[PDB]
Amino acid sequence: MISNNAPAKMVLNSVLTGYTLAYIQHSIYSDYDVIGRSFWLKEGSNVTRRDFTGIDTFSVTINNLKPTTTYEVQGAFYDSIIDSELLNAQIGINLSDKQTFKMKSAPRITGARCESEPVDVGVGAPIVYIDTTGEADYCTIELKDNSNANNPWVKYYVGALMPTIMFGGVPIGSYKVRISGQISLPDGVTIDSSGYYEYPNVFEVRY
Amino acid sequence: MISNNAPAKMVLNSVLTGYTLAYIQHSIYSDYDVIGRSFWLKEGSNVTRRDFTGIDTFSVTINNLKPTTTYEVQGAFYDSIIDSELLNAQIGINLSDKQTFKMKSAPRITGARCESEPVDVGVGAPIVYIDTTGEADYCTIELKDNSNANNPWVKYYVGALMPTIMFGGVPIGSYKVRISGQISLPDGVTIDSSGYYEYPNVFEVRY
Amino acid sequence: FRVVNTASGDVTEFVGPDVKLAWDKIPEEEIIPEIYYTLEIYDSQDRMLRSVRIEDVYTYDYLLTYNKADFALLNSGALGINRKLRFRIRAEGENGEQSVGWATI
Amino acid sequence: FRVVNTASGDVTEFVGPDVKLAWDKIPEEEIIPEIYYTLEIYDSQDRMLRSVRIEDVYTYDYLLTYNKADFALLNSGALGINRKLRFRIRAEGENGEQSVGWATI
Numbered sequence A, B: 001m002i003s004n005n006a007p008a009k010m011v012l013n014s015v016l017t018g019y020t021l022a023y024i025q026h027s028i029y030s031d032y033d034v035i036g037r038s039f040w041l042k043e044g045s046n047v048t049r050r051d052f053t054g055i056d057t058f059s060v061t062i063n064n065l066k067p068t069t070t071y072e073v074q075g076a077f078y079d080s081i082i083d084s085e086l087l088n089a090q091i092g093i094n095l096s097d098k099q100t101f102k103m104k105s106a107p108r109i110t111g112a113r114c115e116s117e118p119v120d121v122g123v124g125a126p127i128v129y130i131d132t133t134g135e136a137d138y139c140t141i142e143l144k145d146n147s148n149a150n151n152p153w154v155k156y157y158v159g160a161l162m163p164t165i166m167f168g169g170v171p172i173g174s175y176k177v178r179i180s181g182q183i184s185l186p187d188g189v190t191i192d193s194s195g196y197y198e199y200p201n202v203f204e205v206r207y
Numbered sequence C, D: 001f002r003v004v005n006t007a008s009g010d011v012t013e014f015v016g017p018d019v020k021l022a023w024d025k026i027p028e029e030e031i032i033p034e035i036y037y038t039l040e041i042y043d044s045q046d047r048m049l050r051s052v053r054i055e056d057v058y059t060y061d062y063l064l065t066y067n068k069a070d071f072a073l074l075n076s077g078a079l080g081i082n083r084k085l086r087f088r089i090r091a092e093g094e095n096g097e098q099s100v101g102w103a104t105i
Helices: A084-089 B084-089 C064-076 D064-076
Strands: A012-017 A022-026 A034-042 A047-053 A059-062 A071-074 A077-079 A099-101 A109-115 A127-132 A139-144 A154-159 A165-167 A174-180 A182-184 A191-193 B012-017 B022-026 B034-042 B047-053 B059-062 B071-074 B077-079 B099-101 B109-115 B127-132 B139-144 B154-159 B165-167 B174-180 B182-184 B191-193 C002-004 C019-022 C035-042 C048-054 C059-062 C086-093 D002-004 D019-022 D035-042 D048-054 D059-062 D086-093
Touching: A012 A099, A022 A071, A034 A059, A109 A174, A154 A165, B012 B099, B022 B071, B034 B059, B109 B174, B154 B165, C019 C086, C048 C059, C048 C064, D019 D086, D048 D059, D048 D064
Parallel strands: none
Antiparallel strands: A012 A022, A022 A059, A034 A047, A034 A071, A034 A077, A071 A099, A109 A127, A127 A165, A139 A154, A139 A174, A182 A191, B012 B022, B022 B059, B034 B047, B034 B071, B034 B077, B071 B099, B109 B127, B127 B165, B139 B154, B139 B174, B182 B191, C002 C019, C019 C059, C035 C048, C035 C086, D002 D019, D019 D059, D035 D048, D035 D086
């Protein structure tokens, strides 16, 4: 009549998916003999396994997330009663219900164009119409003078993404736009960025 | 000389009030027999009661907050020693000190107006002066062509609220502005929005 | 004379809503058949609460209803649950007399 | 007959991967030298698992390998670890007979 009741079933309270990392909120444990967690991920056709030794932490942040895919995550706890072998087998170890989380896509540009009213006379503001279709919270946009060989990049607008981003005050001359971005997480220190993405072809502003 | 000392007094470390939900930070518990929390709210003349079974969570997020009112919240813990009846009575169960939290008001528009310098000649930028007086952190503003029957809404400025929000580059023609908004919470997943608010009367931009 | 449903770590703390009182049989049951146990439960402020006779059973439970309604109302004329209690028990018979001394928690 | 490596707070719970079985010496060791102990371990579903004789030692451990492979495979024809167990032991001799009764957890 002696037994080691395994730690209760694992639940995943909340999921927040970054570009390359997901911050997952979980429940509390028991059984006096736990070692860590064993998270299984369903890429769609292939599975990966990770371990998180140390339990003082209250949430997990998976990394190395393959871009642009919805993953199914499996939570779990394990004690010394079950070894690494049985952990690989995943029998006797309690497992979580099935939850799938979406990876927010990278900041994507869909249209860049200069435009204003047909100038009658005088100096008029030429607007820049750059259209992005991704998702982030600290998107960055930079321009570079195409004419010269070396042109220290310049960043002009920093803010949330929009179907059409328009800002004036740009010089008339040659300028091509790159796109960047970052995504925040409740864990203060962690901050995930995005790869630079320059438009395939430059555009030129003119009155 | 046998007793079940009730869980110690409940304190509310921090309060963060959303438009329709408040994220409250609390202390830790004891007594080996707890079930959840019993939060009482003082609307000003009427009281409501809520329960949060399960203790693994470390903070609470009340919902269904009546708009535009300062509430007094009461924290509490309860064990199986005290039943639902005594919980309704609230005797023997420890209660928190009295704290009142303010609900941030919805994004309110107070003035919309087009203006520029008296145009002498040439093309000049007509500015849009829209004034909002609410409070949020991800306010959104959209314009719609009043002229036509169908006009897929367009959003032009996304950012923090301001006494006077001014942005150029708008077309001259008919356009009426709606106001939206959202408020963030430390809990990553939760995000609370605001109801759409269109100005009662349209305005027209002109040189 | 031990309390069933007792708290881990520290034994002077309850764990269930109803305290379960378990005691082992008095040795002299065999000699005298007509013997019962007088279980009387006291309060935190040294005030009598219950006087219940247990017979044909070597265990007793203290129901939530009892404390929460009957002994709160008849004594304090209100609704409540005395959290801190004192239990004492002894053996008695119809003709045989009391136990040598009180058995208390 | 007590279990070494026992859980705090509640004693009916394990704490280590391998349960350690410790018992104190039977008094009659002196009189008869040729005495051993028959330790047989049962399952949660009242099914025999092990029958092991312990001699020249008053303690025994139940290795992880044993439960996880041998007694999972030979009985359930698969890989597993019976978490809930029952241990019972008694004393026996080559010519001297069994103990008066089984000593069980």
